[PDB]
Nucleic acid binder design. Structure first.
Ligand SMILES: *[C][C]([O])[C]O[C][C][C][N]C(=O)C1=[C]C(C2=C3[C]=[C]C(=O)[C]C3=OC3=C2[C]=[C]C(=O)[C]3)=C(C([O])=O)[C]=[C]1
Ligand SMILES: *[C][C]([O])[C]O[C][C][C][N]C(=O)C1=[C]C(C2=C3[C]=[C]C(=O)[C]C3=OC3=C2[C]=[C]C(=O)[C]3)=C(C([O])=O)[C]=[C]1
Ligand SMILES: *[C][C]([O])[C]O[C][C][C][N]C(=O)C1=[C]C(C2=C3[C]=[C]C(=O)[C]C3=OC3=C2[C]=[C]C(=O)[C]3)=C(C([O])=O)[C]=[C]1
Ligand SMILES: *[C][C]([O])[C]O[C][C][C][N]C(=O)C1=[C]C(C2=C3[C]=[C]C(=O)[C]C3=OC3=C2[C]=[C]C(=O)[C]3)=C(C([O])=O)[C]=[C]1
Lengths: 462, 462, 28, 428, 454
RNA sequence: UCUCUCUCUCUCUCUCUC
RNA sequence: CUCUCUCUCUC
RNA sequence: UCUCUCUCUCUCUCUCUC
RNA sequence: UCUCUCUCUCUCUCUCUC
């Protein structure tokens, strides 16, 4: 049981080491200095170069249908250099085959797609913490208020099962609803070989959505949605109902700390063997890495570097939809809602005035650290029954409804509504779990927060 | 998501280009000079010619029942020419079939009703900014003080859904009340084939009014009004109640900047391809068009050209019922209320002394520009619920009433009254939204106004 | 008589003013 | 009481205005179809006129006829067999009428108001006539119910257009059969109970279950029907308990309203006599239907080799909805013995097209009763408890203790006449 | 009634829409295979076209063929014998068509919808033809059932794809054979009734037991089937019990739906003639099929030394699913004597590959009946309470023994001994004339053999 | 604009252990 | 429940 | 000669470039 | 080799000339 855990840690560390040494090689090939190599924007550009080089289907499409005034075999992006204290942007072009060769040499001749998926999740978390997706929500017919379920909405299809665990209930519902809308518009959807392929995709997406849900009624309803040969308006409405139900009876969304490649590259250049030490995306390793890492960023004139650092921290730990109170408790500084952040996105546009732009250090440090969870809370585990030890008269208790429900009407909407009506926004989940100090590597002594003072806000996008 | 937006912009630009090139053709056929072609009165006459040519039902009625001393196949209007610095009016008559042919040739052989609806909305906005409709309000039994809801009261029926989005809650309530009054007077209303048609019209109008409202109680009350087989005095009183409630819990009225055809014609003659660049009725395009456009108007003796220019500006941007403070902030010059404007309507009557009339340039320029909204404010969106990231004890918060209200006494008047009683005329809506400088094409950096100095007036009609 | 309330046209922060006593006196 | 006197007087006037509309409209249609005094009083003519109005106001079926027209029949015209006697003999000619013209005549007779009460009143009269004449075991066997519960099929032929009023007069068997059809449709079609239309069906299923629950009397029956309603996806199990509930109704009978809906010919004759139902008032459960029938003369077409007395008894039972009532009590009220259905030498009142309208003679219907009684909306007095209750029940418990039958001269129902009592089953 | 008229009208339109699709599809296929009027009206050609459609929509079999392709036959193409008349002589050429092409043609004919009702209708037509032509005693004996219960073999050739619609038309004997085969596989394979698949088999076993139970009429028979369903591990006890149930169905006949499913050539000719089934509607148990066959002319291939009338009677029998019906009643309706199968001087309608397609001549089929009757879904063969109406002191009587009474094998045997082969069933119901489209005046017959397969 | 007392004289079903 | 309801329908 | 109350780590691979 | 926090865009078509 321990051996499997140590191999898992070694494999994750291998992925991290590959990403870091690729970043070091890219910094060497780009002639970036230490400061320029630690800039988050340069790392964003380099990661996007990697992702676009290995986007096989898009590359093939670009070869078949060339873009306007662009070579389909070259990637690029903005690389920022400091000359005499002034920042300037450059568009430098790299062959896709060269990028692929460098990445494979970084991973010891292997095209490790796990690191690519890691960078993809990092970008998705950053986009989730920065930009809202209300327009896409409204277009598909879902309420703009279920933004908390839209984690991982920018993750592309090539992420696969690794990225599927990260995307929330809202994004899966949105994709299924898009499929149903396409089927409603054109009946030739779900017909032909493409029809068989899209039916398989629909079944697989419904199955992973079902795995996301926790209560039996939600699983039964998504099962009923999956069983329809030609899903129409009814299944789209049922999906919307399930998405709204996910606000109270939450789902199992996997949260991982995917740091920018600059941190990994600095760690690998420092001499940290992730293969020997081991890495975990849900434990203390990202926190320990972020505490002793220095990252720089570009601050547009009249912006608050503290707000940008908070945004990057939230993106790194995928805490965009987290309660502001617990996020502030872990960070030690107030996590300000999105409305009151005097900052724009991390990425710099091509039309910006690259003469008033400044540079600031990012405060990616937290007082406490906590375990990142897949669970969405308790829906209402333990000991169901008693095993008698003493020969005493006594009633022998057991949880009869829970035992029987595994051994047994067809309208589960009423049951779901009843379950959500029973719930109150005051129940305590994750009982007995707390936040650990940075020195508590083994997570032995937890600290439970007491939020029973004057009330701060709780929703980042509120 | 971006592709649909660019096609929408292209379609709107196609409509604008058609209107402009029609204006150019009409100016060529009328032998108007540049100054006379830029006169707002001549453009009003030409637009009215277009609208009367394509008013199919009125044309058919005129053919069946001829007017007194008028040819039912000819449109016309006052065309003003300058001879030796003196303005003179002329009544010139054009065949309706000729006007239709010219308009269709302008839109590439298509009878584009979208441009006609655009001109209709421009005229409606001008009439809203110029003339008050208190007599019609009093006749239908509604308070003369709900003039702020009477946007688009002069829009004819042929506008359809495009014009229905522009007309406010007051006009829809007034039309429904007229229908109810007709039903009350004559019981043969709502009977026969005409009865079925008018029942369908009543249902459709109630449905679009329901779409206008925001709070659930208002929607439920208009639903209850719609469900009556023979609506009588009770439904008329409930409609009046809803109209009064719309003063505090405002509705969703769509505001668009519909400029006079002279501006579009000058832009098309200049060489601006609206098809390639794209046009938006809620963005910077009308502001950018108005800044570099010169329009002339006829000033009667003893009038203030600044007041007439302000009136035309308000009409162009549909800011008639806007707060005077924000309108003045956007314009940069004080928007004077209607009572203190020393000016009459734009149109010149046939009995006026066309020898003392003068000409003035219209100052249709604004310092700032802002996005035109459909929303009527907040009624009291965002993030409803938390998705846990860290395994910490914590209460998991959610907005229970908001989630539950979508999953659920019959007298909603008390609830509406309670909702309006909670509201105060000091709440801030449209939070985090500001006015953008004319150079800020992409609407990146907003400017928030601080109206916290000595108080000016706020109501145009006050 | 006059205009009791504002109907917003521009998406700007602003307080939305209305004559609360006049509107409420018809509801008491 | 002493406060419900005003309420009772108000209800009487409203019912009288409905009957006045029915009578006024019949008078106009008789004058507008050019029917003589004899032909106007024919029950066959009255049914045809009544059926014309009911179809003229059938918005849904009229809409479907417009969209999908029938063969040789335009969907804007209605009519039926009108029997005219000239030169001693009877002949039948189909009358075609615009449904809108019929609607205007009906509305004008009701002072321009729709008066949906009158249409439902005629619908109940037709159901009462069908219940006394025809026995629908085919629908009972087709839906899976035992054909022996023919006493619970009261108002099974009523269209769904008769809401509230129609549901009050219909019986447990009809309510169960309606639910069973819903269950059968849901089992066959998986999309049933789902989607926007499923929600509409669910509210209909709930509402019709609620009226069935209110129809029952014992607390056990109400609870079980409550359980059947709660089923989100009812299936075979809900099939069975509804069948069991129907079988329990034979012993623990429900509360089914019984109203005396007379043919429109009787109302037309009364209104022509100057009777003001609005002023004097009316009631479908009191003496007014009995006193109207005593002074009313109506004729019917008699097929050859048919007893006029048996046909008159059939109309008398349909008038007072005594199809499923005890023959002894029905015989005692009428004064002449009421014969069971199997011993009736008559066919239905309505005459078919394929029937030679040349050997048919007319007879006067004897719709007069020696006594008069008040119509009742009540019966008499989980699952193992239900079976226990009907085991204690015996077919000798006296019901309606102290409540009897009055004389036609006793208009206030002051002195009851308790009967003392060989068959008792009409359909047996 | 008066509310079921609307529902009756709805059903007529839906069936008429199905009939329209079959005709529209047949017309399209005839013009695509380049068939003349004579060849378009050939029953053999219609059979090939219908079978091509059914195979094109066989999702399960097509998948198996793809995984395990046959030798020389790609699993993406279907076809059959198409017979063309050139220079007066008949020739057969095997046509190969892409299943995707046939599926698209069928869907286009039905306005882009799958319309599996039309496919099940054609499958029922093939089943009726098989029942009237071929007798499957070998399957009866192989399952252990007595070969004498051939009257209950209705729809034994129907594939499992025909659910509900197919199950309604299939008989007690075929249903019992399905149950027995399930039992035999369970006895032979211990894994059966166990595991994930055993759960699926159990639900399938339950469903077909319920539909078999609804096929019976006597309460004793239904209770006997209900017991067999409860058996968690069925064995020989249910094997024998079901065999008794089938033997009982010979006397206490079940409810088997009978529908007149005509060949697609008849529908194609009707649709090409401008006839609109969707507008005037249709019915498989009413006069509509009888009226269609009166005006419809259909040709067939007649093998040398074969009576054309006997083949026409065989097709007439299959059209109305009267294979197991009384010969006297069938003879009365047709107007010409119906002969038993043993005295039919003809082989099956479908022509074999090995047959010399040079001595074959074509003849017109006499699918005309003197009378027309309503097909029945029923087999062979009072008030007990009161509802008070008046407020009187009487006692509400009820039949206590009968009401509380409803709260095996000897009873069933007793029921059949009372029954005799003389009881009059369907009392007062007769046969109408083709000119009587409204079923107004029945014509009750007065009635040497009565067994087709005797 | 139909018809009928008393076992289906018309009320389909939107395909398969896929 | 010896009268005290009804303005119609998955329209 | 080790550590721990209370599954969430890991391979899952992509209908289409979107 | 792109950009963006926060639905306001667009087709909806008209009881009657009013
Ligand atoms: C178990 C499992 O596997 C099952 O699954 C199911 C689903 C899948 N499928 C799909 O996707 C498809 C199919 C198809 C088909 C069809 C459809 C429908 C019907 O009805 C019929 C059919 O048929 C067929 C098919 C295929 C193939 C063949 O062969 C036959 C499709 C089409 O068709 O196109 C598509 C898809
Ligand atoms: C549901 C949906 O789908 C549809 O809806 C529609 C609505 C509107 N309209 C209506 O409704 C109407 C109706 C009518 C009628 C009537 C009325 C009332 C009563 O009560 C009765 C009736 O009837 C009838 C009708 C029509 C037709 C026929 O046939 C019959 C009207 C009149 O009448 O006019 C109108 C409208
Ligand atoms: C298999 C089951 O049983 C489970 O397992 C696990 C748990 C228990 N344990 C056991 O069994 C074992 C252990 C071990 C170990 C040890 C021992 C001893 C000492 O001292 C130390 C130790 O350490 C360790 C272990 C394991 C693991 C880890 O990690 C550590 C063993 C050995 O070692 O051999 C065996 C068994
Ligand atoms: C479908 C969903 O996912 C949504 O989508 C949109 C958003 C995201 N994106 C994506 O996916 C894409 C994009 C693109 C693009 C690009 C790329 C690259 C570069 O470098 C540049 C660019 O640009 C652009 C785009 C789009 C649009 C626009 O406007 C611009 C793509 C291509 O291109 O291919 C793809 C995908």
């Amino acid at each position: 049981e321990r051996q499997n855990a140590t191999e898992i840690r070694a494999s994750v560390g291998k992925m991290i080491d590959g990403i870091g040494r690729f970043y070091i090689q890219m910094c060497t090939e780009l002639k970036l200095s230490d400061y320029e190599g630690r800039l988050i924007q340069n790392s964003l550009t380099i990661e996007r170069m990697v992702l676009s080089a290995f986007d096989e289907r898009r590359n093939k499409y670009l070869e078949e249908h060339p873009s306007a005034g662009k070579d389909p075999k070259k990637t690029g992006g903005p690389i920022y250099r400091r000359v005499d204290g002034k920042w300037r942007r450059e568009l430098i072009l790299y062959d896709k085959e060269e990028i692929r060769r460098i990445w494979r040499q970084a991973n010891n001749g292997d095209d490790a797609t796990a690191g690519l998926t890691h960078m993809m999740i990092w970008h998705s978390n950053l986009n989730d913490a920065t930009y809202q997706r209300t327009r896409a929500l409204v277009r598909t017919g879902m309420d703009p208020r279920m933004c908390s379920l839209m984690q991982g909405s920018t993750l592309p299809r090539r992420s696969g099962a690794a990225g599927a665990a990260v995307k929330g209930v809202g994004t899966m519902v949105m994709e299924l609803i898009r499929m149903i809308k396409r089927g409603i518009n054109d009946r030739n959807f779900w017909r032909g070989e493409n029809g068989r392929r899209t039916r398989i995709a629909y079944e697989r997406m419904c199955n992973i959505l079902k795995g996301k849900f926790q209560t039996a009624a939600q699983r039964t309803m998504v099962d009923q949605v999956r069983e329809s040969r030609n899903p129409g308006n009814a299944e789209f409405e049922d999906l919307i109902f399930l998405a709204r139900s996910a606000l109270i009876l939450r789902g199992s969304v996997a949260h991982k700390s995917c740091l920018p490649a600059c941190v990994y590259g600095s760690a690998v250049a420092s001499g940290y063997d992730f293969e020997r030490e081991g890495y975990s995306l849900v434990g203390i390793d990202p926190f320990r890495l972020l505490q002793n890492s220095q990252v720089y960023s570009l601050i547009r004139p009249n912006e608050n570097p503290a707000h940008k650092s908070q945004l990057v921290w939230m993106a790194c730990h995928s805490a965009a939809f987290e309660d502001l109170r617990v996020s502030s408790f872990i960070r030690g500084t107030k996590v300000v809602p999105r409305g009151k952040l005097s900052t724009r996105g991390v990425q710099i546009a091509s039309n910006e005035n690259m003469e008033t732009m400044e540079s600031s250090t990012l405060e990616l440090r937290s007082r406490y650290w906590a375990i990142r969870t897949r669970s969405g809370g308790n829906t209402n585990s333990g000991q169901i029954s008693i095993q008698p030890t003493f020969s005493v008269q006594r009633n022998l208790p057991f949880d009869r409804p829970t035992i029987m429900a595994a051994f047994t009407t067809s309208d589960m909407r009423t049951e779901i509504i009843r379950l959500m009506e029973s719930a109150r926004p005051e129940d305590v989940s994750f009982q007995g779990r707390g936040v650990f100090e940075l020195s508590d590597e083994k997570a032995t002594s937890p600290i439970v927060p007491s939020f029973d003072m004057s009330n701060e806000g709780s929703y980042f996008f509120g």
